[PDB]
């Protein structure tokens, strides 16, 4: 597949190009602009800085995958333990779950691009329309589409200066950038989703431990939270923020019930099915 | 954000104190997962 070739190209673009650019991220209820400085060092390590341009000065700096510093607003819900990068993007197996196809050509940020359709092979995940830079393979535009082909989010570069390496001054963060197994399993996952992390956190409101499980298929992710109910009769809940769905379902158990919450960039049905499928580990 | 469900001894209030936090956690975590993409960062920043 030439589409496969493009994905492979996209996969390594990060280590083969140094660049600066500005992009927009838009979803229902949010419009924001950001700057990125990305330098490939002489040893091949990637140093990258991301800065929000409108409103508050949110920022992150990463050095060869590790977060060097991150603004408070981006990390209030992360323990330092959580600072691990679980993985490297691997597109090799993505073809199992998505159909990859070149569907045309486009012009984005003043640059010629090829348009790659990433279409789900099932109903359990969302598709993407990716516009890849011809010169470098970097993603100029990314549209997340629902089942009906409706737009859930837009990620798009407005300006991209490639080849050129950002100066050291530009890679430096502002002061706002702060220097930095569970007894539950799912008895159902959509094809290709696999457990990426497992840990315990404390409930935000009570002294109770809350089990956290994260799953991914290479492109999409969802997280599961299991919280004790202590016999409370709490019903279900649902929410959505742009591409991210939230579903909470009561699970009857022999230990007073549990509330199972699933959050992720997957269809509502998927989250719901997963929530209903969470079970405690047995003796 | 806007928590939604109704009338079965399961207050939105109970959910209100939890759901937004869990949502934040998932998005933020995705942001720091090591992916080369700027997109997870963008999503987290949008919060
Ligand atoms: Ca890569």
Numbering used by the authors:
A (entry chain A): 22 to 126, 127A, 128 to 201, 211 to 313
B (entry chain B): 145 to 191
Text taken from the publication that reported this structure:
AlgU (also known as AlgT or σ22) is the key σECF of P. aeruginosa. MucA and MucB are cognate anti-sigma factors for AlgU activity. In non-mucoid strains, MucB forms a stable complex with MucA that serves as a fine-tune control mechanism that protects MucA from cleavage. MucA and MucB are a pair of negative regulators of the alternative σ22 factor AlgU and are essential for the membrane-spanning signaling in P. aeruginosa.
The MucAperi–MucB was crystallized and the structure was solved by molecular replacement (MR) using the N-terminal domain (NTD: residues 25–208) and C-terminal domain (CTD: residue 209–315) of E. coli RseB as the MucB model. The final structure was refined to 1.9 Å, with Rwork = 0.1729 and Rfree = 0.1929. MucB is composed of an NTD (residues 22–210) and smaller CTD (residues 211–313). The concave sheets from the two domains present an open and accessible cavity to accommodate the periplasmic domain of MucA. In agreement with the RseAperi–RseB interactions, the MucA helix element αI (residues R157–S177) acted as the major binding element during MucA–MucB coupling. First, MucA145–158, corresponding to the structure-unsolved RseA159–168 segment, exhibited an αβ turn conformation and formed antiparallel main-chain hydrogen bonds with the βO of MucB. Second, in contrast with the invisible RseA190–216, MucA181–191 adopted a helical conformation (αII) and bound to MucB-NTD. Comparing RseAperi–RseB and MucAperi–MucB, the MucAperi αII inserted into the inner cavity of the MucB-NTD and a highly conserved proline P112 (corresponding to P112 in RseB) underwent a large dihedral angle transition (φ = −92.1 ψ = −4.6 in MucB compared to φ = −62.3 ψ = 149.8 in RseB) that allowed MucB92–113 to flip to the surface. Therefore, MucA binding initiates the MucB92–113 rearrangement and MucA αII anchoring, leading MucA N-terminal cleavage site to be exposed to the solvent. The MucAperi–MucB complex structure had a polyethylene glycol (PEG) molecule bound, which may be incorporated during crystallization.
